[PDB]
Amino acid sequence: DVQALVVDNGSGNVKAGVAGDDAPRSVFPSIVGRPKNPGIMVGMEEKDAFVGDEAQTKRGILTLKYPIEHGIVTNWDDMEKIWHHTFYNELRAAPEEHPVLLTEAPLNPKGNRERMTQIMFESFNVPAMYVAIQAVLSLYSSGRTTGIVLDSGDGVSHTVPIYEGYALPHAIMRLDLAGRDLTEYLMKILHERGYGFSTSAEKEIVRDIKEKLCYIALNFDEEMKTSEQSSDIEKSYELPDGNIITVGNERFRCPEALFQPSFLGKEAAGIHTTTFNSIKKCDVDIRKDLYGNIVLSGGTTMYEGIGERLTRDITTLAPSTMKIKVVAPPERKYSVWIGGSILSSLSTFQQMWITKEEYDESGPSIVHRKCF
Amino acid sequence: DVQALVVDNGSGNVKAGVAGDDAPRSVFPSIVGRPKNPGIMVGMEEKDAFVGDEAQTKRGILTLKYPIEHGIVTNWDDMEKIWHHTFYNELRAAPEEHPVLLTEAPLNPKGNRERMTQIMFESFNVPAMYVAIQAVLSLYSSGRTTGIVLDSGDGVSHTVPIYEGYALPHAIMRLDLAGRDLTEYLMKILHERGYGFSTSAEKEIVRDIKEKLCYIALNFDEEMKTSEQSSDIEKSYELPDGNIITVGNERFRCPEALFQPSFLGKEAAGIHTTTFNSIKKCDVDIRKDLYGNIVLSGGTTMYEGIGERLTRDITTLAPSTMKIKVVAPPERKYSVWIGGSILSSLSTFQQMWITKEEYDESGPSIVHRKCF
Amino acid sequence: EYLMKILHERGYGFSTSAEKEIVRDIKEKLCYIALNFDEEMKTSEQSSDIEKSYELPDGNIITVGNERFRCPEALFQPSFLGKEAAGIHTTTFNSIKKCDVDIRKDLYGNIVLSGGTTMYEGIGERLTRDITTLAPSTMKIKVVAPPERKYSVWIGGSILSSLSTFQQMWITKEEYDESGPSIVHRKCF
Amino acid sequence: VTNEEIKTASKIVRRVSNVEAFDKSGSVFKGYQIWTDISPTIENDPNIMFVKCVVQQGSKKEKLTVVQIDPPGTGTPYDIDPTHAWNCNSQVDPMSFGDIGLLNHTNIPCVLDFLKHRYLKNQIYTTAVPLIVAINPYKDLGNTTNEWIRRYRDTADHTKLPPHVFTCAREALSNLHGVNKSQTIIVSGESGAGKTEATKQIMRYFASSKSGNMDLRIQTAIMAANPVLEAFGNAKTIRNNNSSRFGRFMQLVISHEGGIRYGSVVAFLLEKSRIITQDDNERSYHIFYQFLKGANSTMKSKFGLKGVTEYKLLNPNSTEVSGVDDVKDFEEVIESLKNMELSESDIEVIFSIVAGILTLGNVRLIEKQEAGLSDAAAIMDEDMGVFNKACELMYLDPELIKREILIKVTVAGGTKIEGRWNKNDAEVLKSSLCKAMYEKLFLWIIRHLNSRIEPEGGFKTFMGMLDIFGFEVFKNNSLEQLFINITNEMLQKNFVDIVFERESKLYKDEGISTAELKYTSNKEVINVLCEKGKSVLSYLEDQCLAPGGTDEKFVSSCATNLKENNKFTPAKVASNKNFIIQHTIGPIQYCAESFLLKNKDVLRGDLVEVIKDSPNPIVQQLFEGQVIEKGKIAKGSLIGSQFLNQLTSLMNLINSTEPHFIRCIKPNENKKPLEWCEPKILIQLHALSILEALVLRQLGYSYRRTFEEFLYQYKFVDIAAAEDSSVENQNKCVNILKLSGLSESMYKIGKSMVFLKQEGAKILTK
Ligand SMILES: C/C1=C\[C@H](C)C[C@H](C)OC(=O)C[C@H](c2ccc(O)cc2)NC(=O)[C@@H](Cc2c(Br)[nH]c3ccccc23)N(C)C(=O)[C@H](C)NC(=O)[C@@H](C)C1
Ligand SMILES: C/C1=C\[C@H](C)C[C@H](C)OC(=O)C[C@H](c2ccc(O)cc2)NC(=O)[C@@H](Cc2c(Br)[nH]c3ccccc23)N(C)C(=O)[C@H](C)NC(=O)[C@@H](C)C1
Ligand SMILES: C/C1=C\[C@H](C)C[C@H](C)OC(=O)C[C@H](c2ccc(O)cc2)NC(=O)[C@@H](Cc2c(Br)[nH]c3ccccc23)N(C)C(=O)[C@H](C)NC(=O)[C@@H](C)C1
Ligand SMILES: Nc1ncnc2c1ncn2[C@@H]1O[C@H](COP(=O)(O)OP(=O)(O)O)[C@@H](O)[C@H]1O
Ligand SMILES: Nc1ncnc2c1ncn2[C@@H]1O[C@H](COP(=O)(O)OP(=O)(O)O)[C@@H](O)[C@H]1O
Ligand SMILES: [Mg+2]
Ligand SMILES: [Mg+2]
C-alpha cells in the first residue's frame, strides 16, 4: 500500500510529511531569495535562486520574497520553486507515486485552487489530489465534532463553527490581520527608541524579537499605567553582530493590535469580537455548545497569556450563565497538519480523491464539485 | 600544454614568475636610472637607461625614478622599459607564447587598464590577457571565502570585504598612504639629529634604515614617556662609507603615522579606523564573520608588533562580545602573487581570458566588460 | 558621496572634508535628470555634446560626461549606491495605496514637491511619467513644483505661527516647569 | 538471493521486436511459442525470470491466451498482454554450433535459455566472435588432460572444433610464431567466476610444446606468490569476500619451439584510497587483519600491537568475515615469503613497516593560535610518544618527519621563509605518507619476486595475460567505481576498434564492398569523463585546489559546464549530491559524497629526500628511481592524475600488442555445480558488455554461413532450385535468393559463404 503526502503551506512556514505520522517531517520557511551582489571568486555555486532554509543562513546577501500573501498566491513561478524543493529535496519522494492533500483558507478566490489543481496535475503528475480547509483539520486533530475554531497564522485569521459534523457556511468569518502585520507594527513602533530596521533581511530579526519578548496583557490600561512606575518591564536582546537593545512597553503593545486593530490603521473588530459575532449568527439552540469549545490554532495564538485575555473578554460579551471554555493545546502550531494526516489515513476518505481521469475529462473546474 | 605568466607590479618591487610555482621567480625594484655625469673611458657600455637591479648597484652615478605612483602609471615609456626587461631579461620567455595575468588596485581610473591592455596586445603580442585585483588574490592564497583584506604596499592601502565569494563593492575603501610616505616622513624627521638625506640615491639608505630598525609600539604615549628615562631605545646603523648614526624615538614614530596620518599633514583616518568603517558598511548579519578573518597583506604590514596593535585598536571599537582575529601569515609579502598563480592554474578560469579576437573586434574597452 | 565616488573613473580624487564642498557645487551646477535612462545612456556614446567643463578654485579644468545624469538617477534606483530600498517614485505610489479607495483620486491630483534635492532639471516630467505608469489609466497625475520650493517649509511655518487660532498651542514655561520635558509628546503631533 | 538483484535484473530488461504468427491474413497458429514474464511459478521461484508459453489456437490479436510449458506449472490458459511477450527460437538447436550471433531472434530470454541449455549438459564454453564466454562449473570437466592439448594443437583444423580457451591459446601461439607480433589475453570477470583456472590452463597449454615439458619453475614460482598477492592486493567488499583491487599483468617470453623461458609480473591501478577509510560494511586489505591476528607473542611485544578494534585506519564495526579464518592465512603468507628467498630479517623489516603504518595512523593533530595564524597545526602531547614509535618501526628520523609534516618552507626570489601548515593540510600530508609507504612496499615485493625470473635480453616480442574486472552497475557508487567504469570505457573503445578492423578485413577477403560498415564510437563519454579542462576529473581537481571547496560545488559546476552534451545529467531526488552518466551499457548513478576527502593526496620532494636517507637498505630501496620536483603546487599529484597516468601507460602497453578476449561467469553463489540463477547471471551479462557485443554484431551482415549449411537450413523453403544437382552452390543460392523476394539491401553472396542481415534471416524463416 502507498501513503499520501500531506503538504500544509501557509503564508509563512511550510509543513510537509507523509500521512500516518504524528508530526510534520520537514518544516521550513517559504521564501525565495536572490543575490544582489556580483560573485567574484571562481569555483563557487553560481545559483540564481535560494529556497527555504538555505536562503535563511545567507540572508545577508539576498533579497527575500514571499510568494503567498494573505493566503493568496501572488507569484506562481516562485510557488513552483517552493513545491519542487519540497517534494524532491525535503521529502525526497517523487509525487508521481503518492496522492497529495493540499490545504487552503476559506473565502478565497476560485482561480487560486483551480490553478493549484492545474499545476499539480500538469507540472507534476500526481495520481490524485484533494484540497481541504485548515479550520476543519484543526478540529479533526482535537477529538471533537462540535466547536468553533479560531485559526490565526501569518496571513489570515478566520473563525469556523461546526455542530456535530455539519458546517454552517453563513457564519464563517475572515480577517486579514495576522502575524506579518504585527511584525510590521513592531518594526514601526521600534523607531521611538532609535532603532531602524528597514531591509528585508532585518525583518527576520524583528520577527525573532517578537517571538522571544512579546506577551499579552490581561488589562491593557492598568498594564500601561503600572509600567511607568518602574523599570522591571524592560528586557535586553543581542543582535547578530553584538549590539544590545532594550524594549519596554513594546512588549505588550505589539500583540494588543489583535484586540484593537485601529492601532495599525484598520477599521475592523478584534479577534474577541469576530469570535462572538460568529457565534451570534448561529441558531439559538446550538450556541451553548460553541461557548464550551473554543479551539485556538495557528502560530499567532502562541503568545503568553492569550487564553486568559480571550476568556475574560468573551465572558463580558456572553450572558451571565454560560460557561466559556477556551482550549489551547500546547502543540497548536501543527494542529492543521496532524488533522490532515488523521483525515488522509481513513478508509472512508479513499473515495473522495480527485483522480486523474476526472481531471482529464472535466478540466480544472472539477475542484468546485468534489471539494467543499 | 602552456603555462601562464603572472606579473604583479606594484609601486615598489616587481614580482614575476610562471603560473604553477609557489613563489615568484624574479623580484626586483621598479626603477629607471639615468646617468648624470659624462663617461670618459673608452671601451665601456654607453647605455643610457639602467633598469631594475642594475640601476641599484650603481645608484651613486644615476638619477632614479619610479614610473608608478599611488598605483597609477605616470610615465608609459619607462613602464614599457620595465616590462621589456621583465619579459626578455628576467623571465627569459617571449610573451607571444603565454597568456599574461596582470594586477591592479581598486578604484583606479579606467584609462590605466585600457592603456595597459592596448600595450599588451599591440607592443607585445600576447595570445590572451587578464587584469585582476590584488586584495582578491590575497584571499585566494589563504584558503578562505569570507574575510576582509587589508592590503598595504608602497603606493596604496585598501580594504576589501568578501562574504562567501560575493563582493561588496560599496564597502571598498582606499587610502593614499603607504610605505613611500613613511620613508619621506622618516627622511624628514631625521633632520632633528643632524642627518640630511636629500638625493634620490639617499632615499634608498633611508628605506633600508626603516626596514631594519623601525617597529610599532603597543601604546604610543606610554612608549614616548618611558623612552625619556633611559637610553636602551637607541640603535646604531653604519652607512655605506663607514659613518655611524644613532636613532631613538624615530624607531616608533615613523610607522605610527599609519594610525595617525595627521602626523604627516593628511586629513584622513588610520588603518584601524578605515578597517572598522568598512565593516560597518556591510549588513548586520555578515559582520560577525568579518571580525573573525582580518587578513594582512603587502609589505608595509611587516612591522614588528602590528597584529597586536591592530587587534587592541579594533577591539576597542567593536562590541564587547565579538572575537577579533587578525591573521598575519609569515610570507604575507608575496600573497598576491601566490594567489594569482593559484587562480591562473584552474580549469574553470580558462574561459575568462581576453583573447585576441575579442580585442581585434571590440577595441581596448573590452576590459570593462570581462574584468571586474 | 556617490558622485565623489564615481568621479574616480576619470582620474579625479576628492577625499578631504573641504573637497566635499567642491563636489557638492559641481553637483548643483552640472547634474540633471534624464527622462529615459537607458536611451540617454545609449545616445551619449555616439557624440561628445554631453560633456561639460568646470574650473576648480585654483585654476584647473575638469570635464564630466555620463556622471551628469548618473548621479541623481540613484534617487530612482537606490541599488546604484548599495541600498535595498525603493525609489522616490515607488515610495510615493506605495503611500497612496495605503489610503482608502475613496481619497486616492484627490492625492493623484496634488503631488507637491519640496526641499532642495527636488530642484534638478527635469524631475517633474520623470516623476509624472513614472507614476502614470503605475496608476490606473483614467487618473490625472499632476505634480506641482513651485519655483521657490527650497524654502516652502519656512514660509509655511511663518504663515502658521502668524495665526490667531495658533496662539493657544504653544508650550508655555509653566507647563514645562510642572510636567517636565515629556510634555512635547502630548501637545505636539 | 536478495530483492535488490531482482530489481536490478528487472530494470535491465528491454523490449523491441513484436510478436507474430498471425500469418498470413488470418489468426492461425503453428503451435507458436513465446517468452513471457507473468506466471505463478515466477512469483514463487526467485531463480526464474521468464517462462516459455504456447499460445492457444483461437486467441485474439488484442490479448493473448497462452498455456506455459517450460516449466509445466499448469495447464489452465490465462491472458497476458502483447507487450510482455518476447519471441523464441524453436527451429534451432543450441548444440549444432557455438556462435550466438547466428540465432534468428536475439534478446534477453533467448540468450539466457541458450546458455542454460548448453551449460546443463556440461558444455560451458560459447563463442560470440571474437568473444569467448566461459562459465565456472565448480568441478572438473576433464579438459586438463594432455590429450586435449595435443588434439587442439596438432590437428591442422581447429576452427571447426568446439570453443575452448585453447582456441585463443592456439590462435595466439600461431600469430606469435608466424609473424613477429606480440599477443595479449584479457581475462575479464568477477573475482569468483574462475579466472585463475583459465590462466593456469592457458599457461599449461603454453608450457607443453613438441619439445616442451608440462610444469615449469616459472609456474611454481608465480603460484608461490598468490598468497602474498591476495593478502596485499585483495579486500572484502559487500558483494564478495576476496575481491581483487588491482590489475595483474604477466609478460612471458617463450622460445620458438620450447617452453616458457622467462616471465615478469606487473601491477596496475592499485586503489590507494582504501588504505585510509573504508565503507561501513567492508574492510581494508587482508594483510592488516591477518598479520594483526596471526602474529606470535614476540612480535606483539616487540612491535607493540593491540587489538583489531583499537586502530583508526581499520573500520571497527566490520572486522570479522565467516568464510575467512584470518589466522592460518598468516602462516600461509609467511611461508610464501620464505619460498621466494627472503631471510628472516627481511620479514621482520616488512612487518615492522606495516606496524609502523598502523601506528602512525593513530596520531592525532590539534589546532593552535600561534605564528600569527588562527589554526596552526600541532601534535597532541598525549601521542608524542606514539609518534616516536611510528618513526622507529619505519627506520626514519622522528625530528625530520615532524619538520616535514608541521613546517612549510617557501623560497622567495632569494630568501627562505619558514611558514606553518594548518590542521587539514597536515593531516593530508600524514595520510599521503602512509599510503605512499604502503604502495611502495608492495611494489618492492613485486620487484624482489620478479628478480628471480628476469629476462636479460629485455622484452621485444612477448606474451601477455591481463587480469581485469568489469563495470559496477549497482546504485551505491563512489569514486572507486567511477575509476573502474572509466577503465572499462577505455577497454570498450579498444575492443570496438579491434572488432571493426577484423570485420573490415573479413568483408574484404570474401569480395564484398566495405563502404557500408559503420560502427558507433564512445568518444563523447570519454571526453565528458577524462578530457583536460572540460571533464568530471578536471572539475574535481579544481574543487580540490580552490578555496573552500565542497562536493556540492563540484556537482553544481559539473551541471553548469557539462550541460552542452547529453552524457552528463543531474539526478531528480537530492539533485545537489547525485548525478548520472550515460555510459555505453546504460545510465549509472553516482553519489558525490566524500569525493574531496578521497581525492586529496600530496607528497613533496623534501619528504622523499628525507626517506631516501634512511640507514636501513630496504627503506633506501623503497622510493629509489622516483624523481622529485619541489617548488610547485599540487596540480598533478592528486589521485585523479596518478590514475590517468597509469591508465595511459596500460593502454599504451595494450595498444602495442594484439588482444584476445575472454569472459568468465559464475552461475550461482552457493558453489553447488549445475545450478542457475537468471537474475545473478543477467547482471553479469550486462556488466561484461556481452549484450553490447551482440548489438554490435547486428550491424552489417550478422548471419554468415557457407553454402552447405545455408542449403541445409533452407532446403524446405525453395524446392525449385535446391535439388537440381547440376549447378554450383553459388548459383543455386542466388536463385533461391532471387526467388525468396529479398532486395539487394538485405543479402550478400560471398565467394565462399553467404551473408544475411538480421531482418533477412527473420524474413526467410517464414
Ligand atoms: C538598531 C541597530 C543598531 C543600533 C545602532 C544599536 C544601538 C545600541 O542603538 C543605538 O545606538 C541607538 C541610536 C539612537 C538612540 C537614541 C537616539 O535619541 C538617537 C539615536 N540609534 C541610531 O543611531 C540609529 C540612527 C537612525 C538612522 Br541612521 N535612521 C533612523 C531611523 C529611525 C530612528 C533612528 C535612526 N541607527 C544608526 C540605526 O537605527 C541603524 C540604521 N540601525 C541598524 O543598523 C540596525 C540594523 C541595528
Ligand atoms: C648623515 C650623513 C653623514 C653624517 C655627517 C654622519 C655623521 C656621524 O653625523 C654628523 O656628523 C652629525 C652632524 C651634526 C650633528 C649635530 C649637530 O648639532 C650638527 C651637525 N651633521 C652634519 O654635519 C650635517 C650638516 C647638515 C647639512 Br651640510 N645640511 C643639513 C640639513 C639638516 C641637518 C643637518 C645638515 N651634514 C654634513 C649632513 O647632514 C650631510 C649632508 N649628510 C650626508 O652626507 C649623509 C648622506 C650622510
Ligand atoms: C582632481 C583635482 C586635480 C586634477 C589633478 C586636475 C587635473 C586636470 O586632472 C588630471 O590631471 C587627471 C589625472 C589623471 C587622469 C587620467 C589618468 O588616467 C590618470 C591621472 N589625475 C591625477 O593625476 C590624480 C592621481 C590620483 C591620485 Br594622487 N589619487 C587618485 C585616486 C583616484 C584617481 C586618481 C588619483 N590626482 C593627482 C588627483 O586626483 C589629485 C589628488 N586631485 C586633487 O588634488 C583634487 C583636489 C583636484
Ligand atoms: N512563540 C511565538 N510567539 C508569537 N508568535 C509566534 C511564535 N511562534 C511563531 N509565531 C508567529 O507565527 C507565524 C507563523 O505561524 P504558522 O501558522 O506556523 O505559519 P502559517 O501562518 O504559514 O501557517 C509567524 O508569523 C510568527 O510571527
Ligand atoms: N621588513 C619590513 N619592514 C617594514 N617595511 C618593509 C619591510 N619590507 C618591506 N617593506 C616596505 O614594503 C614596501 C614595498 O612592499 P611590496 O608590497 O613588496 O611592494 P608593492 O607595494 O609594490 O607591492 C617598501 O616601501 C618597503 O618600505
Ligand atoms: Mg496555517
Ligand atoms: Mg602589492
Numbering used by the authors:
A (entry chain EP1), B (entry chain CP1): 5 to 376
C (entry chain BP1): 188 to 376
D (entry chain AP1): 3 to 768
The authors write:
The mosquito-borne parasites (Plasmodium spp.) that cause the disease depend upon an unconventional actomyosin motor for both gliding motility and host cell invasion. The complex includes the malaria parasite actin filament (PfAct1) complexed with the class XIV myosin motor (PfMyoA) and its two associated light-chains. One of the class XIV myosins, PfMyoA, is essential for gliding motility and is the best-characterized of the parasite myosins. It is unusually small, consisting of just the canonical motor domain and neck region that bears two light chains: essential light chain (PfELC) and myosin tail interacting protein (PfMTIP).
We reconstituted the malaria parasite actomyosin filament in the rigor state in vitro using recombinantly expressed Act1 and MyoA:ELC:MTIP complex in the presence of a small cyclic peptide, jasplakinolide, which stabilizes actin filaments and has been used for cryo-EM studies on Act1 filaments previously. By picking well-decorated filaments from the micrographs, we determined the malaria parasite actomyosin structure using helical reconstruction methods to an overall resolution of 3.1 Å, as estimated by Fourier shell correlation with the 0.143 threshold criterion. As typical for actomyosin cryo-EM structures, the resolution of the Act1:MyoA:ELC:MTIP structure decays radially away from the helical axis, having a well-resolved core, consisting of the actin filament and the myosin motor domain, whereas density for the MyoA neck region is weaker, but nevertheless allowed us to locate density for the light chains, ELC and MTIP. The upper and lower 50 kDa subdomains are separated by the actin-binding cleft, which is in a closed conformation in our complex. Our actomyosin rigor structure shows that neither the SH3 domain nor the N-terminal helix is in direct contact with the actin filament and the closest segments are about 18 Å away. Overall, the MyoA structure in complex with actin is very similar (with an overall root mean square deviation (r.m.s.d.) for the Cα positions ~1.3 Å) to the rigor-like conformer found as one of the molecules in the asymmetric unit in the recently determined MyoA crystal structure. Notable differences allow interactions and avoid clashes with actin, including movement of the HCM loop (Ile409-Arg422) by nearly 4 Å, slightly smaller shifts in loop 4 (Glu369-Ala380), loop 3 (Pro572-Phe581), and the HTH motif (Val538-Asn563) as well as the ordering of loop 2 (Lys632-Ser639), which is not visible in the truncated MyoA crystal structure, but can be seen in the full-length complex with light chains. In MyoA, the majority of specific contacts are formed by the HTH motif in the lower 50K domain, which contacts the actin-actin interface (buried surface area 554 Å2), where the D-loop of one actin inserts into the cleft between subdomains 1 and 3 of the adjacent actin. The Asp544 side chain of MyoA forms hydrogen bonds with the backbone amine of Thr352 in Act1 and the side-chain or backbone amine of Ser351.
